[PDB]
Every structure is written in structure tokens, then in C-alpha cells.
Amino acid sequence: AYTPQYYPGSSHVAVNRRKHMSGDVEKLRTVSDDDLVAALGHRAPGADYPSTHPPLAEMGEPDCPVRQMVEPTPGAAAGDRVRYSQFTDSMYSAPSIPYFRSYYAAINFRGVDPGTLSGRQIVEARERDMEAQCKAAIESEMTCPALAGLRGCTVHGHSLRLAEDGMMFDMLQRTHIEGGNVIEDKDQVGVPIDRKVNLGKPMSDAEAKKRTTIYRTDGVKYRDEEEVLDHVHLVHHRRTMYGYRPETAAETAPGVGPVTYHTV
């Protein structure tokens, strides 16, 4: 079968990007089921999953050939509500960047609705499926609990100076450091919870730069990653050419000029 290559580039940042896309992300910490459910804020830990419609087996389905060959996720079969996890990630070398969180979701999980924005990245899915996807992300090297956190609202912070203790600014201060560990004591929409969810130690600055997918001047400078720039240019050029005419001849139409690439 076809072997994916995912993304160009040769720096360790490009290597990290391919790790996130391929799902080959190291597990770094453990978050209990009850702690994660409390943080997400959609139901009480241990409570039954609420439903938005009856289980498929109980209500039946239309005679659709696609339904009959596409297996529903566990949460879809059960009729769970569609709920969400949402993360914000610092531009000061957080492990994750928004688009690559969405690629991780889209490549590696079934029945997911990821969304990418500058200051927030969301995964919507049937509740129990969403929980499993969030657990994978939050336990992995995609997360530093100082540089990233669950924020379902009031997300400001990705682009701000870090606090003196290295925590990304949160207007609602849903997390804080206690004894070297990041503690979350509000749910993702700012409601106090009756527990202290221990997300463990923040990454060192050096570890963050080894694990990050972002290019910036204090790490891997974007200007030096000529393979990614070539890729961007190739895609823009071919889009421009084929919007004019969808044929090979458009690639040398008048107006293209002496286009040139670094590595190809």
C-alpha cells in the first residue's frame, strides 16, 4: 500500500511535525479518566454519558449503502452528545501548533471534527470518542502543561509573554504551579472543580525546544528550512497555473516568469 511521507523538511522541527501527523508521539504523563472528565466539564466523573439521540441499534437506520459499510464509532453507536476539547498553545516553543493538532486528529482518529485557529484548536466528536482523543493528546509530548492548556473559552495567551513562572497567561487562571507541578482546579470553561488535577511538571525550556513543531528565531529559523519554503512555493504556483488553465501548458504560460526553487 502507499507509504505516507506526510510533510517535507529536514530539521528536528520537521521531524516533530511528522511525529504529530503520523501519531508517533511519546506518552509523557498519566491523567486519570476521572480527572480528565472533570477538566472537560461535560458530565460528572463516573456519570452515564448523556445522549442526543437513541442508540443506533434501538432506533434503526435508513437503508443507506454508506451507513452499511462504515462502522460507527462507539460514541456514535451509543448516541452520545457531540462534545469537545479545546487547547491553546504558546508561540514560545510549545510542543504543538494548531494545524498539526488538527492533522494529528484527522489522520489518527475516526469520526472527528477538528478546527484550527490562531489562539485555540478544537476537536469535536461524540463524547466518549472525544475523551479518548483528548487523553491521547494531553498525555503525550504534544502537551507541556505550562505552555498549553484546556481552554473552552477566554483563550487569550498564545501570543503573549509568558508569566515569570513560565505559565502561559490565562485570564481565568484555570491552572497554576504547586510544588513544581501544574495543577488544574477549574474546568475548561472556567468553573471551579472540586479537585486538583495534577498535570505534572512543565517541560524545561530546552526540552520544549527539542519537542516543538514551531519555527522561530530562537529555535529552528524558518528562513533556513528551504524544503518547506519550496513546498509552499510549488503549491502556490501550481494553484495559480491551474486556475488559469488546468493543463501542463499553464506551467509556462506568459506571466509565470523564471520561477525557481531551492532544493528541486
Binding site: 503573549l160 487562571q173 519555527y215 494553484r239 486556475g243 506571466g255 516568469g257
Partner: protein, 560 residues
């Protein structure tokens, strides 16, 4: 030629916001002061207390913000108007709070340009009247009495209060210097005096020819009570009354209807046409405003064409405010709206730094204004260099990144600097448009983010639709506008497109971009807003020093 200096242009504003700050520091102490840190928020809270007490119903209250926190858990930072000394609180740039911004749009909306040649031909053909400088002069006196809402034919007419309509007037303009010199100068836009640099006056007169036009500006209060669709109709009614009186016509004969059709339709040049049903709007509203017309309304180009960047960035300031803050942020949505989506393009000298850097790069690599190759390779080079340099600025100066805290702001500013550099360098708006989309693609891969959820709808459609020639895709940038299908929804683009449309013609050393009638009309100093220096006007509005038209103080009570 221009030489980019050793200190970034945005450093002054950073130092003025953060006295004593080490601009390399990536960390800061958060004090979580809340709203009490800020004089404007405190003034708003007190205003909300009075509102609630006077009407018996809760209104503004900072404590209603969710999460038990008020605005200002971080520092609330003010904004320097770019190229100005004025630093203002952010709320002072909200369109609702800023009369300069309101009056800029009202001045556009209340304007219509109406040809006189067809009307004169009608008088000659149907009535056998001779049109002379003397008859035109009598007409210009008549139309400046009637246009604000006063009577010239009937008995027992009631009229508008002249003080409520003091901003309404009509001037004529023409490429015929002999006619222009015969009419009293109070009634004429003097093309030669206003367009005295780089032979711009001769370019405009050659383009307009020996044709005669009226620049009509109906009262601000009228468009405020009503809409932009009032403008061409109001204009035509009083043009018609004035022709009736000035040419001794029957006050309502068949020939009058030819004058009406001419003034309403055949010789009328709207600022904007109507919009489709989902966003139904009358003519002369922002969604119908083309980028070429927007660029031509701004007048910095007649003051200092030797600095193409300045005019370019005044167009950006004009367009980003109008299109993002008033049009998208109000007409098409509302609420708190979209102030900072637009301020990023006209404050803190940020876009200026990134654009002058690019201008210097292009001058050194490709040569003089407007001489760079008009091709995709050149757009690629300029966009990539300008975008990489800007991203490096945001990375090296933490408080710069914190200013443009939303990715959408960063995307529009990096892409505007890229496309304005390309426009000035190549003199070609369409090539600049390729550079705009290239900036976005470069940006996305560097940081793994771009703008808001729906920022790059036009972005991802963008490269392939620059050079399409299909019916609803192909269009030169000058004729695109806020109703071009891909552009019809989203912040952070429309005013920047007007800006680099201006940049291409500034780089070519043209006198205008799209319509010489628009260019002359908006050069007139008798307008309320000063179209020659947009950001200076915005500062006045933010400082409560801009006097708008349309207020009703003459006809309302006051008292304790």
C-alpha cells in the same frame, strides 16, 4: 531613494507603551489588576451606572464578564496612530466612539457624481435653450440653495433648517479649463491647484476630457436617518428643481423627465452598486465599494507622490476601518465588533516598518518604483522576503507579537506588507494579489497557524483565482470589491486589497487607479473629513477633537 534605517519603525511605539522595558524579554509579571487599571474602562463603568439609574434597567457592568474576571487581567495597552504622536485608548478607535470614522463613511455615502453634458444637450434639443457660463453660474447658485432642502419654485413650502444641513453642497468640475475659469471659484473644484505634483492635473484633465460634472454631497443628517440609496435620488430631485428655475422651464414638462433619468441613471456615477439578496443593501453602501474607488478617494497621492508607501498605508487605514470596523463589524454583524482587527493595520507603525523594509529590499534588488518584472517569480520573491522579515520581527520583539495578539491581524499585516511591496515594485495590482496569497501560505507553515477559524476562505481560494478568467472568479483587482464572491464575508482582507491596489498605481506614478472622477471629487477640501491624511483624522476622532456633521443640537432640549 528611500533607505531603510537601522532602528525598526515600530520601536518608538513599544518604548512609549512600556517605558523602561527590555524589549527582548519573553516573560512579564502579571498583576491581574482588572478594569481599575484603565481610565477608559473606569469611565465606562461610571457611565453604565448613570445609564442604569436613568432608565431603571441594568446595562454596562464590567463584572458581567464571564469567569469572575473583569477585562485587564493582563495590561490593557493603548494605541499610537501610525505616523502620528497621538496615543489613544483602544476604545477610542471603536467606530461608535469615533466621529472621524463615522464622518469618513458618511462623506462617501452622501456623495454622487452627476454628469452635466447630457442635461445640457437635453435643454438644447428639446427646448432650444443656449447653455452658457452665465446660465451655468445661475444654475450653480440655484442648486446650492436647493440641494440642502430649500424651495425655489412653489409657494408655502417648508424647508430644512440650514444649520442642520451645513455640510451639503454641490461643486462642478471639468477638464475644460476655459469653462472652469469662467465660473465663480466657490463653485468649482480646481484640478490645477489640487493636483500640482508630477503633472497629475494634466493626467486627470486628459482622462476626463472636455466634459462637465457635478460633485454632489447630500446632507449627513439625511443618510443618517435613511441610507445610501437616498443619495442619488436626493441629488437628482434638487438638480431637477434647479434646472427648472435656471432655464425657465415648465415646472414639470416632458423634458424634465429626461433630466431626471440623466441625473438618476444615465449620467450618475454611484460610489457603489447594489448587493444580492442575502446581504441586500441599497446603492452607496460599503459592500458595493470597489477597491479601485476606495483607493481613489484617498488623497495622499496628490500631496506626496514621491513617497508611494505613505499614500499606500493611508489607503490601508481608510479601507481597513471602513470595511472591517463599519461594514463587516456593524452592517454585516455588530456588537463589540472588529476594532483591533483593523487597528493592527494603522497603529504602532508596524505595517509601516514591514512595508518600508520591503520597499528598500525591492529598490535595491529590482530598481526604481514600478520597474520590477510583472510575473509570479517576482511576487514569490518579494512576498517571501517581506513575510519572513516580519515574522522574525514578531519573534524577536515579544511586545510586538503581543500587540498583534490575534493571528488574523498578523496575517493581514504580513500579507499587506508583501503585496504593497510587490505593487510598488511592479506597478501591477494583479501581480501584487499573487504576492498577498503567497504571504499567507508562507505564514501558515512557519507557525502552524494563520488567522481565525474562517480567515483563509479567500486565502485558500486565492492563488488560483488571481489568474482565473472564469465568470465569477476572474476580475482585475481594481474592479473587485467587498462583493467579489470569495471576499464577501471576512475581516482582515478588504481594506488591505484597497491599499495595495493604491500601491500599484503609486509605484507606477499614476494620478489615480480606477476613476478620475472619483479622484477629483474627493480632493475637494470642502468635505468634512480630510481625505488627504486618514490616520491624522482618526487620531482627532479618538481624542474627541473631530467635529462631525449631522448633529441635532439645534432642535433638541437640554436642561438639568
Amino acid at each position: 531613494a528611500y533607505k531603510y534605517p537601522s532602528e525598526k519603525l515600530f520601536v518608538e511605539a513599544l518604548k512609549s507603551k512600556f517605558a523602561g522595558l527590555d524589549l527582548s524579554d519573553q516573560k512579564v509579571k502579571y498583576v491581574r489588576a482588572g478594569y481599575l487599571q484603565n481610565a477608559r474602562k473606569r469611565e465606562f463603568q461610571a457611565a453604565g451606572e448613570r445609564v442604569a439609574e436613568q432608565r431603571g434597567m441594568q446595562q454596562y457592568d464590567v463584572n458581567v464578564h464571564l469567569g469572575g474576571m473583569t477585562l485587564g487581567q493582563r495590561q490593557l495597552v493603548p494605541y499610537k496612530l501610525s505616523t502620528r504622536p497621538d496615543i489613544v485608548e483602544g476604545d477610542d478607535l471603536h467606530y461608535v466612539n469615533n466621529p472621524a470614522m463615522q464622518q469618513m463613511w458618511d462623506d462617501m455615502k452622501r456623495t454622487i457624481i452627476v454628469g452635466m453634458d447630457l442635461a445640457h444637450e437635453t435643454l438644447e434639443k428639446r427646448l432650444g435653450k443656449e447653455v452658457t457660463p452665465e446660465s451655468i453660474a445661475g444654475y450653480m447658485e440655484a442648486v446650492n440653495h436647493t440641494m440642502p432642502g430649500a424651495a425655489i419654485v412653489q409657494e408655502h413650502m417648508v424647508e430644512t433648517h440650514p444649520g442642520l444641513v451645513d455640510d451639503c453642497y454641490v461643486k462642478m468640475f471639468t477638464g475644460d479649463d476655459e469653462l472652469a475659469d469662467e465660473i465663480d471659484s466657490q463653485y468649482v473644484i480646481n484640478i490645477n491647484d489640487l493636483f500640482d505634483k508630477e503633472g497629475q492635473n494634466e493626467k486627470l484633465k486628459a482622462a476626463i476630457g472636455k466634459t462637465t460634472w457635478q460633485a454632489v454631497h447630500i446632507p449627513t443628517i439625511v443618510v443618517r436617518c435613511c441610507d445610501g440609496g437616498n443619495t442619488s435620488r436626493w441629488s437628482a430631485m434638487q438638480i431637477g428643481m434647479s434646472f427648472i428655475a435656471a432655464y425657465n422651464m415648465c415646472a414639470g414638462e416632458a423634458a424634465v423627465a429626461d433630466l431626471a433619468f440623466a441625473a438618476k441613471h444615465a449620467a450618475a456615477v454611484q460610489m457603489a452598486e447594489m448587493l444580492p439578496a442575502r446581504r441586500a443593501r441599497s446603492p452607496n453602501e460599503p459592500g458595493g465599494l470597489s477597491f479601485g474607488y476606495c483607493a481613489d478617494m484617498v488623497q495622499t497621492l496628490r500631496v506626496k507622490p514621491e513617497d508611494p508607501v505613505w499614500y499606500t498605508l493611508e489607503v490601508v487605514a481608510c479601507g481597513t476601518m471602513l470595511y472591517d470596523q463599519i461594514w463587516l463589524g456593524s452592517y454585516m454583524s455588530g456588537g463589540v465588533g472588529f476594532t483591533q482587527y483593523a487597528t493592527a493595520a494603522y497603529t504602532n507603525d508596524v505595517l509601516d516598518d514591514f512595508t518600508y523594509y520591503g520597499y528598500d529590499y525591492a529598490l535595491n534588488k529590482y530598481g526604481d518604483d514600478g520597474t520590477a518584472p510583472n510575473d509570479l517569480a517576482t511576487a514569490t520573491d518579494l512576498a517571501t522576503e517581506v513575510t519572513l522579515n516580519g515574522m522574525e520581527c514578531y519573534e524577536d520583539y515579544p511586545t510586538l507579537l503581543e500587540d498583534h495578539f490575534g493571528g488574523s491581524q498578523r496575517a493581514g499585516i504580513l500579507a499587506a506588507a508583501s503585496a504593497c511591496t510587490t505593487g510598488i515594485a511592479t506597478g501591477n495590482s494583479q501581480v501584487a494579489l499573487s504576492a498577498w496569497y503567497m504571504s499567507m501560505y508562507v505564514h501558515k507553515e512557519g507557525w502552524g497557524r494563520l488567522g481565525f477559524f474562517g480567515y483563509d476562505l479567500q486565502d485558500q481560494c486565492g492563488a488560483t483565482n488571481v489568474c482565473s478568467y472564469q465568470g465569477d472568479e476572474g476580475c482585475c483587482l481594481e474592479l473587485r470589491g467587498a462583493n467579489y464572491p470569495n471576499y464577501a464575508m471576512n475581516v482582515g482582507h478588504q481594506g488591505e486589497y484597497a491599499g495595495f491596489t493604491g500601491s500599484a498605481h503609486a509605484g507606477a506614478h499614476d494620478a489615480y487607479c480606477c476613476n478620475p472622477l472619483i479622484k477629483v471629487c474627493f480632493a475637494d477640501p470642502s468635505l468634512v473629513f480630510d481625505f488627504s491624511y486618514i490616520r491624522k483624522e482618526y487620531a482627532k476622532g479618538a481624542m474627541r477633537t473631530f467635529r462631525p456633521a449631522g448633529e441635532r443640537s439645534l432642535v433638541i432640549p437640554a436642561g438639568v
